[PDB]
């Protein structure tokens, strides 16, 4: 809450790392412990990211290529819902926050306002008719994280449940390159996309624009403003060396 005074104490408490990851067996207090930390943080009026389940990103509905970050990806549904609740949870503090770097030109529909707050920005992110929401959310997440990393005086607590999903690949795979090249007939293009399924390398979570933002804050030093209290999830399906088919009932 007041970190700047306690800086030495804090840094020794984590031993120089940026916050903690809590780990255990399936079904001990982990997700619950994270809930509690969000409660402690937000009751004390600290700005708090809370990703309640990481699987909404890495194992998602669908995956778009991000709009203004070449070579990265989005989970558009995860992102939108996040931008929504983040805003309404932190709205008090986020309305005081002035934007140090965001373009002042953001595309806007007639009768709508240029965001002057971080709150206003997050708002601008998720309030649109689809499909527009989809590209808006990309831009908005990029700039949101760019804004977070630029704030050095205000304590920021990032709680992610199931960090271990962010540290390896998402379950999306790169599109087969023949989706990118255009086609005349399937008859002879020298193309198999319709004949056989195949696996292409998985997209690593670090190439998700959001997770990119966070990793950027972890790995760069000169950010002792931020505290990751984060969690693990062992919620995986059981596998013992033979698997039948699960009875669906």
């Amino acid at each position: 809450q007041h970190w700047h005074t306690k800086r030495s104490v804090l840094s020794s408490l984590t031993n120089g790392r940026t916050g903690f990851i809590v780990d255990g067996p399936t079904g001990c207090g982990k997700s619950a412990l994270m809930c509690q930390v969000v409660h402690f943080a937000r009751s004390r009026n600290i700005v708090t990211l809370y990703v309640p389940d990481a699987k909404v990103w890495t194992h998602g509905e669908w995956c778009w290529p991000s709009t203004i970050l070449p070579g990265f990806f989005d989970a558009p549904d995860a992102a939108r819902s996040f931008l929504k609740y983040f805003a309404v949870a932190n709205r008090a503090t986020l309305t005081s926050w002035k934007l140090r770097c965001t373009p002042k030109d953001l595309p806007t529909e007639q009768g709508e306002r240029q965001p002057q707050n971080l709150y206003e920005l997050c708002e601008w992110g998720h309030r649109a008719v689809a499909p527009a929401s989809i590209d808006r959310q990309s831009v908005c997440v990029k700039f949101l994280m760019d804004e977070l990393s630029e704030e050095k005086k205000l304590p920021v607590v990032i709680v992610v449940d199931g960090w271990n999903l962010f540290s390896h690949e998402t379950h999306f795979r790169y599109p087969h390159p023949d989706f990118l090249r255009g086609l005349a007939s399937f008859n002879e293009s020298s193309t198999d996309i319709d004949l056989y399924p195949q696996e292409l390398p998985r997209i690593p979570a670090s190439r998700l624009s959001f997770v990119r933002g966070l990793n950027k804050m972890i790995l760069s030093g000169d950010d002792p403003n931020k505290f990751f209290i984060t969690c693990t999830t062992r919620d995986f399906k059981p596998f013992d060396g033979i698997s039948g088919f699960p009875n669906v009932e």
């Binding site: 669908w62 599109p175 086609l183 399937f186 319709d194």
Partner: protein, 56 residues
Amino acid sequence: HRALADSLRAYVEFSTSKRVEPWDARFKPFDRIEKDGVYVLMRYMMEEKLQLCNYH
């Protein structure tokens, strides 16, 4: 011979002609409004291919 000729004609006419959409829209990720999610993924990235194979 003519039953065969005719059924070959039919088989090929079917392979060549378009079909109804194969996915059941009552479930997800397909129920979602045609302006979002999977349908976005289809309209911009997959459309050409989906039409080449005639939605078989």
